[PDB]
Design a protein around this ligand. Structure first.
Ligand SMILES: CCCCCCCCCCCCCC(=O)O
Ligand SMILES: CCCCCCCCCCCCCC(=O)O
Lengths: 257, 233, 283, 68, 282, 234, 68, 48, 67, 57, 74
């Protein structure tokens, strides 16, 4: 049945017993750059196995007090082994992704998590003066990601960080309209996972990984993790698709914390 | 020296006009297009997207995430679980959904509206709910009997947890006003328990369900207008 | 000369006792259920000649909107030279109604029309006579030199386009082709103009995160052309802008809160978009 | 070098199928060097909402069990 | 071909037959059908006269004044609110037009609107005032309305509007039929809401008639110029005509002067006809 | 670009203009038409409908229901019992009928006019009436003799409860003014008893007649004008 | 894409036939996409008075007695 | 006179305006071109 | 006497092939007796940089020894 | 219209005749393009030199 | 008969005084008999049939000693 799926990429495989079918953003499968649409002129690097494989990010705990988690997609993978090295060695690059989110629970657990993929996930600055935006470091959490809150506390470490109400998705929009974005839902009653295939999406064919986050990942509790406090782990595993790079240079090393 | 006459309307600026205008940058080379993913052709393609209804905008739940959670209980109740007036661009809860927001830019509208509900309960719990739509101009449903009399569907708990109901386009006028109107209302939407939710041992005795709203394929709008939701000092 | 397509029509449909019923689904899949009334209730045949013309993106974004208001003063006092002309950053950020409509999409590509509505009044009781003035709106692309005063050499505009308009005549108008660098304009930018490297300030990015650091289309320079009068006259330009030949990609939620500033940042006093209802059961 | 296209229907048309003859037409001529100077484009009502409402890798039919 | 003419007269002689077109019965609901060739001996007359000015398109083809709005551009702070004027969309303000429109129960048409502007110095002391531009905008029902002349809603991102310089040709715009029905009704024998058992003992008094039923929004007209030491009174007249018009279900003309927007009568004017000394007085 | 010259009449507003103009609401969907019953295409279609004549203009019968009721008696009389001045738009008795009101929106008119009468007395009563039209420029029809000299019919009361008299379009002018123009005199419409109404015992001896006025098929109107029957405060 | 029609006659014009002379000829082009922007329609002299003056279910003849 | 309507943009001077205009000197006899070595067509020819 | 020419590609025009649709063309008429009155002529995109970048009596190929 | 120059795909070169070497003393400009200097990919180039025409300048 | 002739003069006044409000409008009987040159030409014939076109020329001044600002009138 459609519930059981196997995803194979590169040299690793995900086998899932209970998946809610699968989603492809816009119905558009990731592809490589065509000759008809190209800025770079150098022969591209196409590290298909080294890059197009699944990697697991550190899991998070779902508590009844959790208000959500978030990641910047290429950022969470920026230090990710061989993939990460190509991102730092090249100026330009492009990739799609397969994002698989899994959260197992007992038949006696209740609750739900929505998974949304946001192109250009620009988050609001935490500080009210708005005379300072979020620093590179604070804006790029790495594998761990960040979290959503339920209060806004814009004190003038706060000055340079992002903050987001879960309620407004850090964007000033209502979260209930998040469904406009490619999405899939993990209802513990129905499925263990969500799978979304993501094409590279920009105004540019190819761009610089160290400067721009093509997509963000937003996971929100939709329904509380009721149980008759409980805790349930959530694991996010991601693979690049059709990865390619241009503009080979010396290793790029970003500002560190 | 072709004789001509300037008619009324000459030398005026209409913000909604459509005239040709000389390019200020002649022969400028425009960056070639690429196949950018996710192309939108019409706003109605977005009107048909299901979004959540902030139905529980009640004290303690207003402007928070819990606002989208419709409570369920396993106790006997004859009361409606919820009530909405079907006024997608004027109701406090509906004017903010994607359907309402696109629609807030229009004066009038038509077509059927689909609602989908999802049980976010335990797998262990079972039972049945009554979803119902009552056309305009009558006492809104006060109980289950009224709910059974009008258009309705029974939504069983089951593996295909989601269930949709469609509020059919029943209207005297062809198009309804988006704006609240004493004359034009879209009727009422309610939900009642068909039967008590049955909850097994060591299973949550309280749940939630989510509700979504979207345009049906026969949906349309008539005229673009400024929205009331955004303002500026 | 073909008839345009209509919205979905309805086939007459009987009730059913089907064991395959479209009412149930699994929204968890990311897919919306597709029921139309004929799938739920008995329906009549309906001929549908209604269309979605007004919701085409070309129609939605087909109206000119005020985007900015600029002001300048023609006067003759020692401290007034600097007020004779107005330099403004080209953006749609200044007005909320247009910005919100544009924010429905992540990317967009279009040509623009610029229309200028001029007005003037006396800010002073002198109420003296002044002559009808000519005003100049010059465009200065990024990196081009800017005027130090209203009376300067840059106003020669030998390469820069510039329009001269008389007060009392039809509002001046011109077309601007898509001038984006990318293949679409980005409404949002989840990134930095530059990457602070290991050898940098911990807070680096604080002065450039967001679209605010990559979106630069130059400025408009507006001056009265006429030499000054003994009698001060205050004037202003209501700049109108309209998308034309517009296509968009990647839809997103509309803004729910009071904008403020250049980014998406909200203010603490306006983070509550919905009104309260006394009860879940209230109609 | 003019083009003739039909007009959107008005109050007097008894043909909401745009079939009342030559009566309803308009004529347009482009007068400028760049197409950016042309008036708004022809209306195009082609749509495909499945892109945003059912972007499912697996084809689903409306009466199919969503999950088997 | 040739525009069809009115009835021609055929010649006829005396009739002593039993056909009798002269006698009838109007009890049947039919009108009499007799013409001169039935009643008198006639000559042939060729009739080429054409009923063109009686076509409904012609009858309703001239623009009528509908409303006059008063705006004042003034520097006095207590007069600032007069800088703009919001008018309900209606045709009920002027009687000559209503009189003709109300001949039909239903109608469908496109509308042409034009404006006429004029201005003066209402104050004792005149002085230099610059040419004003007026902003006319439509605010559909449900759209936000400005609280002030400088209210942000004058951005008009969606609401259509016109910017007119005083002295240029009077502004003009076409509005397509905007009904939500398949016709505009000129009458409504009913209530917006049906009061139900209980509630308000005897409701409907505040919501009976067309006046309740069809909300067409408002037209907002502002001066666009900031104020001056010398102030200006500006009058704008709104003119309208149906174009591309069809009508159904004809009605009698009104005899009583209208008591406003309803069909109501004033007790002072319910006597439409003058007396004549007698039946036998010419 | 293209050299042009503006002519007199440029930049003026005429209420009679018939020019194209830009749409304020581009690409608006006009709610489709339906077959609404009772379509009217021309005002003359209403001009031809028989409506009542408010003939009983005598003070006390004015602006009341009785205004349309013409009394008849079985009393022997040679008196005129009806006097119209014809001008549909200017005659105080006709100007308020639908035909007259339509004509009060026009400057000129032509064609024949029909007058239809209905007897509403007892079924038992009988008799004959003289209905007559006398062309203008003549002494008013003082008596039955003059009425007989002009154009007339005799209405013999019976089952066919109504009759129609037609006042043919006899005019020196092609069209007459709707206005009270002494030049284009209407002529006279009158009525005399042809015979005393015969009333048998035990029936009413006083009865009413109703009269109607309508346009004939050769009827038409010319220039449109404001009607003087409606007014308002400033 | 201009359409043409017969002009209404005037003082020096031909008889009411309006068929004499190609010089009686008004030419027009619509310049807008919405037909609501077009000038007024052609005179429609079609008439049907029976709807209001003789809407009798029975067939009534003028010579026949109205009654019987 | 042919009915017309002036649209926004009328009576304005744009420095990049490209339209026709009357000749200051009607029938002026323009000096014939001659070949001159070094013809330039585009600024990019110098950029290279 | 009107000429018809192809317009420069705009924001939402056809493919770079510049040969798709009739809506990409424009019409122009000269209204004056003196050609100096004509609007600017069409751009000539023909180029020949070798005139200034390789004006060598004896032609050389890129890979040929320069000397 | 005429257009600008495209880039052909290339690979490694072990040629005895090298395009990257020249002698500007001749008065000629260097003629090498990216495809001669490094391995390149094919690129379709429609970035037309219209704004740079003398007529536009 | 191919030229336009002046046929009448009308007098309109914008009055700031309590009186002369009535002078804001002028009702004239339509005729050509106010002008001798035109009527004499027309009177060459007993009968005539023609279409007529009218053109108006407006001119104004400030008749009072107390000159001051007046807005353009319609
Ligand atoms: C002589 C005046 C020329 C006017 C120049 C206006 C340039 C407008 C396009 C630049 C802005 C592009 C980004 C955007 O759509 O906001
Ligand atoms: C920018 C101007 C748009 C104004 C739209 C307002 C609606 C105009 C129609 C008003 C008359 C409706 C009732 C009727 O025709 O019987």
């Amino acid at each position: 049945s459609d519930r059981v799926r196997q995803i194979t990429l590169g040299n690793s495989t995900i086998t899932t017993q209970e998946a809610a079918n699968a989603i492809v953003a816009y119905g558009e499968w990731p592809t490589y750059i065509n000759d008809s649409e190209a800025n770079p002129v150098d022969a591209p690097t196409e590290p298909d196995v080294s890059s197009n494989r699944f990697y697991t990010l550190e899991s998070v705990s779902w508590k009844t007090t959790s208000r959500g988690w978030w990641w910047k997609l290429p950022d969470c993978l920026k230090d990710m082994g061989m993939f990460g090295q190509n991102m730092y060695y090249h100026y330009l690059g492009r990739s799609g992704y397969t994002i698989h989110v899994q959260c197992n629970a007992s038949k006696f657990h209740q609750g739900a998590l929505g998974v949304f993929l946001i192109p250009e996930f620009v988050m609001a600055c935490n500080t009210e003066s708005k005379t300072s935006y979020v620093s590179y470091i604070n804006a790029n959490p790495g594998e761990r990601g960040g979290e959503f809150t339920n209060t806004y506390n814009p004190s003038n470490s706060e000055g340079r960080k992002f903050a987001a109400l879960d309620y407004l998705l850090g964007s000033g929009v209502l979260a209930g309209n998040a469904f406009v974005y490619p999405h899939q839902i993990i209802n513990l009653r129905t499925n263990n996972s969500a799978t979304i295939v993501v094409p590279y999406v920009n105004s540019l064919v190819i761009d610089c990984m160290a400067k721009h986050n093509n997509w963000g990942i937003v996971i929100l509790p939709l329904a509380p993790l009721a149980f008759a406090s409980p805790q349930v782990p959530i694991t996010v595993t991601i693979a690049p698709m059709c990865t390619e790079f241009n503009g080979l240079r010396n290793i790029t090393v970003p500002v560190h914390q | 020296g072709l004789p001509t006459m300037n008619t009324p309307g000459s030398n005026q600026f209409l913000t909604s006009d459509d005239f040709q205008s000389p390019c200020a940058l002649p022969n400028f080379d425009v960056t070639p297009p690429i196949h950018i993913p996710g192309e939108v052709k019409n706003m109605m393609e977005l009107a048909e997207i299901d979004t959540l209804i902030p139905m529980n905008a009640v004290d303690g739940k207003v402007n928070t995430m819990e606002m989208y959670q419709i409570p369920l209980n396993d106790n006997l109740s004859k009361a409606p679980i919820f009530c909405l007036s079907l006024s997608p661009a004027s109701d406090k809860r509906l004017s903010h959904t994607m359907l309402g927001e696109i629609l807030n830019y229009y004066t009038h509208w038509t077509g059927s509206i689909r609602f989908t509900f999802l049980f976010c309960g335990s797998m262990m719990a079972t039972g049945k709910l009554l979803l119902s739509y009552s056309p305009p101009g009558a006492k809104p449903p006060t109980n289950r009997k009224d709910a059974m009399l009008g258009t309705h569907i029974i939504w069983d708990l089951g593996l295909q947890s989601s269930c949709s109901m469609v509020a059919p386009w029943i209207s005297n006028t062809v198009y309804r006003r988006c704006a609240r109107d004493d004359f034009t209302e879209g009727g009422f939407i309610t939900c009642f328990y068909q039967t008590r939710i049955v909850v097994p041992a060591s299973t949550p005795t309280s749940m939630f369900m989510l509700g979504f709203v979207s345009a049906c394929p026969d949906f349309s709008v008539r005229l673009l207008r400024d929205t009331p939701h955004i303002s500026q000092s | 000369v073909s008839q345009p397509p209509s919205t979905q029509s309805t086939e007459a449909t009987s009730g059913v006792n089907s064991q395959e019923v479209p009412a149930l689904t699994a929204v968890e899949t990311g897919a919306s259920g597709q029921a139309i009334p004929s799938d739920v209730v008995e329906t009549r045949h309906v001929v549908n000649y209604k269309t979605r013309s007004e919701s085409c993106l070309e129609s939605f974004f087909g109206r000119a909107a005020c985007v900015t208001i600029l002001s300048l003063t023609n006067s003759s006092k020692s401290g007034e030279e600097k007020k004779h002309f107005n330099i403004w950053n080209i953006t749609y950020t200044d007005t909320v109604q247009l910005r919100r409509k544009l924010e429905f999409f992540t990317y967009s590509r279009f040509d623009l029309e610029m229309t200028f509505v001029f007005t003037e009044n006396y800010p002073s009781t002198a109420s003296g006579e002044v002559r009808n003035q000519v005003y100049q709106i010059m465009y200065i692309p990024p990196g081009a030199p800017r005027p130090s005063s209203w009376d300067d050499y840059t106003w020669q505009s030998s390469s820069n386009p510039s329009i001269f308009y008389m007060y009392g005549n039809a509002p001046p108008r011109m077309s601007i082709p898509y001038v984006g660098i990318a293949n679409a304009y980005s409404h949002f930018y989840d990134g930095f103009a530059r990457v602070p490297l290991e050898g940098e300030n911990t807070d680096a990015g604080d002065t450039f995160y967001g679209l605010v650091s990559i979106n630069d289309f130059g400025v408009l320079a507006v001056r009265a052309v006429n030499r000054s009068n003994p009698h001060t006259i205050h004037t202003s330009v209501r700049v109108y802008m309209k998308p034309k030949h517009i296509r968009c990609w990647c839809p997103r939620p509309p803004r729910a809160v009071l904008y403020r500033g250049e980014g998406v940042d909200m203010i603490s006093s306006a983070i509550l978009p919905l009104a309260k209802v006394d009860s879940i059961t209230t109609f | 070098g003019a083009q003739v296209s039909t007009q959107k229907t008005g109050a007097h048309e008894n043909q909401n199928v745009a079939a009342n003859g030559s009566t309803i037409n308009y004529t347009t001529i482009n007068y400028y060097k760049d197409s950016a100077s042309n008036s708004a484009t022809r209306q195009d009502l082609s749509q495909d909402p499945s892109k945003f409402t059912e972007p499912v890798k697996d084809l689903m039919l409306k009466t199919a069990p969503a999950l088997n």
